Homo-oligomer: 384 residues x 4
């Protein structure tokens, strides 16, 4: 189970670089030079790295320091063969963003947020990124009166429309992906799930430029089925990117390594991604637990990729097993894929076998055989 | 706080008519004749009632018994002045629907589900209903392999498209509203939240015919902010109907009377509905607890309407209070409603006050004054 | 992975016998004769069965019908070699228990509940049961004023004390196990977790007669770590019995087959039970999904036992792996098992290496190596 | 609704002093001098303040700086009349505690944790504290193999037993209160609820010295009923202290001001505390949202006390209302407080009215009238 760059595994600088500061504790690890992270990730078999602007260029850096930082970073990419497929903006750490970026109540902050984002889109394009992610972590509220959500959605649409006008006018070949999260650090965050993000995109002026970047743990913080949500995103043609990690239920955002948390959900996710032919990066947005030293950081990163590859093998074996293929037919998955009424509305209305002479009791007695199918899935996952 | 029919309060037959059967217990109340429910609800001050087909006409009824049941029902409506603004299909109780209706794996069941629905659309139109609700309670899965969600969404789109073709071809003036629920009775239900439903509607052939019927408790079963979700539905122009009740957190669907459960969420909901000018029915989908006899059923129903009217008064007092209006300006809710960049993209790019010469530290130091605003909201809710 | 009676697997009559009635649907399966369930479970490799009084003898049965039902049941046990290690009372289905049994507000109901329980203790002892389980499913409330919880705990203590006096006075060799559940069917249930049950037991007059019967899914309905709770129960010497099933997060009680739901929690549970030498029954309290016919019921039951046996093998391989044993020492699990201060209080106070000259920065820099240990656990679970 | 010191309101230094650092953002407020917090809280009407050792004396302070800091603090207490009823240890912020204090795998860390705690017990006693709180925020795990929970409970018992030996040997009049939390910052925290803490205390060598310090938001992070848990703690005689705040459901620990979050749970909590005659401090462990400047900090603190006093008035009016008293009798709360069988076991067995001639159908038909009682409670809370 050794990763190759053709497995398309990517990591954020802020993942292995997380120093371990949490709401109740100081950092347990020293800062990582982005250049060292690139080289260590390259040796593990990753395909590339992603960044927030403030990960690479500390806030307030002079334009000269900014150019020096980018040059060192570019040299590390050249030295390693690593790519930068995705970038994002930090609109959440600095105190100015305490009430949001694109939907801050203060108009001057919203303008500043847009200019900060546009500056990093230029840099992302320069470094070859194909997707630009927006996680509106501070867009939301702790109390009901603080945010008129209709006005806030107007402002969010205005911001994304302006960003689309910018990339269109510059001729950039980059697309946007909205990353939903239900809560944390705000009490409730706007566009809290994949569904809300997908719905919002359809109201943008140029919807074809926007998709979603769902994260395993975020949908699970709402108790939702992550593979189901990914299926809906794929169905809509909007899965532009994906963030892989682990989460144990409805609680704070754990960002465990992928494979940890809900293991069977991870199996069904990989099954779906591989069956659907998802060709984007397999990006890990995880945090090595602050119990770990730097050797544990690399072991945790390695485990992300290993667990994906193990699950990929087991899901492939599941789908290729002739007894599973017969069980799928026994459960009528083949019939689910057939149109209900390709014969059309009036033929359905005239079809006495669909109502007047339909034997409901015979249909009701047919078992779905789902439990046998699921135990075959369990046996394959466990190698049993 | 006495309701009038002009308050637009409606109840489902299945609400006050719930006999109290739960997964662990027998019924504690006798069946209610729909005619008696209409008259008792009329005396409480309700504006109308809603029904599933199987609430009014027991499953398997002959066409003659069906006509007799409708006639008795129509006479009760005429006797009381009660209206029927909404109707729905029961595609969840009968065993034939154990794997769903519109997305059952068995094709013959899906055809039967559509014919059962179409028959009740005709009846709903006959009785004057303006909205037809679809709650896909059995559409979903308990295990990963049982349902290919992309194929299931294809089937769900096919079913709703066929329904839209039906109403269009018949010239009916009725619209559809999808009611999301995250889980129960299926392990995960398709279109689990308002967001997922809104996103799905945009892929239908005639999206203007479809909106959402969100329910307080259902979004709270995902830990989501119900007023936020309603705001997004209103923002999209898709709030066709609404189901009011109470829910205490992430657990089984409690269907408590409205006002119970999360009281402050109920206050912010009423504030939003009244401020936005929502003109649809205020529908209660609640269950009188099975601890109650029939006098408790009517007390619980009365409390639904009373709590709405109390909250309506308190929210109106909140918005009209001059000290609240000044606090809203102190928190810059006025600035949230102003466009970020009506001056346009290039002016924003050339605006040095938006980035180069923006004083981030002065902006960051400005308190949002949200806690004072929220305590004014608390004082008004409590009459303090 | 074939079960033998020496694996101590047991099932409730109400598990494979569940007809599939849920809050929104009719039964999908016919009733099972308890005699047929005993024989089918015996053929699958189970060691025994458990029952509620009302599973075996329908409510209201004459004393003659009761004797006939027990005799048929006893003959099936004799024919199959099946044992009855546990029994319980149904104090939740009949409408008289709508506000509880032992803590119903009505005093006459509480007396009736106790007499119904005592009658079944006599039967359980006659059939050889060693543990008597109490699940107070109706003890609780939907609203705050309905139940004074201090008075209700007084009544619950009174009931269990009377039961202990009964078994002591009759010389029975049976013990009691309280089964906690946080909610459903009541809005909140008294003694909602393993912890609350353990704490309550210490206030009973004869605490040695009472322990807990924790259920996987119930603790997970509170988002708790089930292996952690079992460890505390074992630590207290109170794990008298255990209910195994699966649950996907905080939602309604799913009662999925064991192994489904949180797979890694199931692995750590089996690891703990086998390492601690738990010698009680491995009881499955699960519901075959109502999608299933009777062949699916037996496949689901078989999968309970299969998944336990697979996990038992993998946990044993984990603990026996020399690289895991070295990793445990690397993470200082050996030091966790050593006393902090067997040298005593005053020696600790005089130990300058414990404070004055303790190098906190050297200690803080030591990685815990937990992520490498957890990936070894993952590899072993998956057979990788 | 103006607080007086006789209302016994207390605040932690770390509450109004929270600078607003969260997992995703920098501090939004400057540090508060503890002396200024004491004076500002005194002017709001608080009775006293609480502290962690590291709040008052920064980690690593020389013994001379420590004496200067305590003297300045003592002078502020003398100047204001403020008391220090409770103190606690910070065993969670410094990196050395990354795997816990009392249950760290490393033995030398556990010894250091005990010495750090003992040093602050001496200081707490010097300043007049009656309760010493232990919140084991780092005791727990993110993965299953990292912590043997039985060994960890052995170590936790060893630590608390040693602390009890210390206070007994020094003749101190101080008691201990364990503060449970289910998760955050560890993936799962040991003793996650009030129940688990109560159960653990009964295994300590001197259980009379230990009780619980439950926090509103912590029990709600497990979806539990906080008033129910407080009732069980009072029933056990173990409510030594209480932490008041607000929380919106199962998510990260919000620490909202008291009254926010679940408003009706706050009403039933105050009802219980006042009816039971709880005489301990009313302590607020809350965080002013980081959106706020220092004027918002004091408004949030003021709102804690105001909301308690409003709810106290409404609960008192509820219990004193003659129509509520009659409704309580209608719901048989009076019968709940009467013994089930003060006549004894054998009389219950001989009582034919308790079983043989009990009319279950008449009993089952009696409504509990809980919904009318709850709407009276709602009307009183809202002043309607
Ligand atoms: Mg995350
Ligand atoms: Mg992410
Ligand atoms: Mg509902
Ligand atoms: Mg509804
Ligand atoms: Mg269960
Ligand atoms: Mg059970
Ligand atoms: Mg807290
Ligand atoms: Mg606290």
């Amino acid at each position: 189970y050794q990763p190759t760059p053709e497995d398309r595994f990517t990591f954020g600088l802020w993942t292995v670089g997380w120093q371990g500061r949490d709401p109740f504790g100081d950092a347990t690890r020293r800062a990582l030079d982005p250049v060292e992270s690139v080289r260590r990730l390259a040796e593990l078999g990753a395909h590339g790295v992603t960044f927030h602007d403030d990960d690479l260029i500390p806030f307030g850096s002079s334009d000269s320091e900014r150019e020096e930082h980018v040059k060192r970073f570019r040299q590390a990419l050249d030295d390693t063969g690593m790519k930068v497929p995705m970038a994002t903006t930090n609109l959440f750490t600095h105190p100015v963003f305490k009430d949001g970026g694109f939907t801050a109540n203060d108009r001057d902050v919203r303008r500043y947020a847009l200019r900060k984002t546009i500056r990093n889109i230029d840099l992302a394009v320069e470094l070859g990124a194909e997707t630009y992610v927006a996680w509106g972590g501070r867009e939301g509220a702790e109390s009901g009166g603080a945010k008129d959500v209709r006005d806030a959605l107007d402002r969010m649409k205005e911001a994304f429309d302006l960003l689309g006008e910018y990339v269109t006018s510059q001729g950039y070949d980059i697309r946007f992906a909205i990353e939903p999260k239900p809560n944390e650090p705000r009490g409730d965050i706007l566009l809290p799930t994949v569904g809300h993000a997908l719905a919002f995109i359809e109201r943008l002026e140029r919807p074809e430029l926007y998709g979603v970047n769902p994260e395993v743990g975020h949908e699970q913080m709402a108790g939702l089925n992550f593979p189901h949500g990914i299926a809906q995103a794929l169905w809509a043609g909007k899965l532009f990117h994906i963030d892989l990690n682990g989460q144990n239920g409805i609680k704070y955002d754990q960002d465990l390594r992928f494979g940890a948390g809900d293991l069977r959900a991870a199996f069904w996710l990989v099954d779906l991604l591989e069956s659907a032919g998802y060709s984007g990066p397999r990006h890990f947005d995880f945090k090595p637990p602050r119990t770990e030293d730097f050797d544990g950081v690399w072991a945790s990163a390695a485990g992300c990729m290993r667990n994906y590859l193990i699950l990929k093998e087991r899901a492939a074996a599941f789908r290729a097993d002739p007894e599973v293929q017969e069980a799928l037919r026994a459960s009528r998955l083949d019939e689910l894929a057939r149109p209900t009424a390709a014969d059309g509305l009036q033929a359905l209305l005239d079809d006495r076998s669909a109502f007047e002479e339909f034997d409901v009791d015979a249909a009701a007695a047919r078992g779905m055989a789902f439990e046998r199918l699921d135990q075959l899935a369990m046996d394959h996952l466990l190698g049993a």
